Design a protein. Structure first.
Length: 204
């Protein structure tokens, strides 16, 4: 059984200080969107992503074309974040994002198409049109574990920026190589003070 968090700790278990990391090509389900993540569009994006991810995962409970492949643990939700103009924490409506879930390498475009058809039958009211499969190499980054509320992220980002300066790294964060968060904690399960989120920023 594939478990990305356990098998690849370098990517999912950084320390609470900035470190360089090269993130190689990985396979993802992705949904692009816009606007405040407290809004409907983001809720639907995440719903759609999970509808497909769990269709693929829960395929194991029946006889399917996926019987021969390994089972897997559904990985943490992740997101890339940007904006057309200068990013503003006080203007969440202007946010642009991509919501993502890593997939096993065996998940191909044919598997995605199959999953969409299965999910349409099982949950006809969940639209999955925006779910795409993308193999993506994030590349050279700096990352750090952020423990605590999202509002305190500014301090973690500041440490990361300071590390970049000291190490002679260029900050590539923008529309192309994007600010990246990996949501290790479920806010239904973890006290705000105990939320774990990986922040990862692209460098050159």
């Amino acid at each position: 059984k594939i478990d990305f968090k356990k098998e690849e700790k370098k990517f999912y278990a950084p320390k609470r200080k900035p470190e360089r990391i090269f993130v190689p090509e990985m396979n993802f389900l992705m949904v692009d969107g816009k606007g405040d993540p407290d809004g409907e569009e983001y809720q639907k994006a995440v719903q759609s992503l999970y509808a497909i991810a769990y269709t693929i995962k829960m395929s194991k409970m029946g006889e399917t074309r996926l019987d021969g492949y390994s089972d897997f643990v559904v990985p943490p939700l992740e997101g890339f974040w940007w904006s057309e103009g200068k990013f503003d924490l006080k203007d969440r409506d202007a946010w642009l994002w991509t919501s993502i879930l890593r997939q096993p390498d065996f998940v191909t475009e044919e598997v995605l198409e199959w999953a969409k058809e299965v999910a349409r039958k099982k949950k006809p009211d969940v639209d999955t049109s925006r779910v795409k499969l993308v193999r993506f190499e994030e590349g050279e980054c700096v990352q750090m574990m952020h423990v605590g509320p999202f509002s305190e992220e500014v301090h973690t980002v500041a440490e990361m920026h300071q590390f970049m300066e000291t190490e002679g790294l260029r900050n590539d964060t923008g529309a192309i190589r994007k600010h990246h968060e990996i949501y290790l904690s479920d806010p239904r399960k973890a006290n705000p003070e105990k939320m774990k989120t990986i922040l990862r920023l692209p460098v050159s």
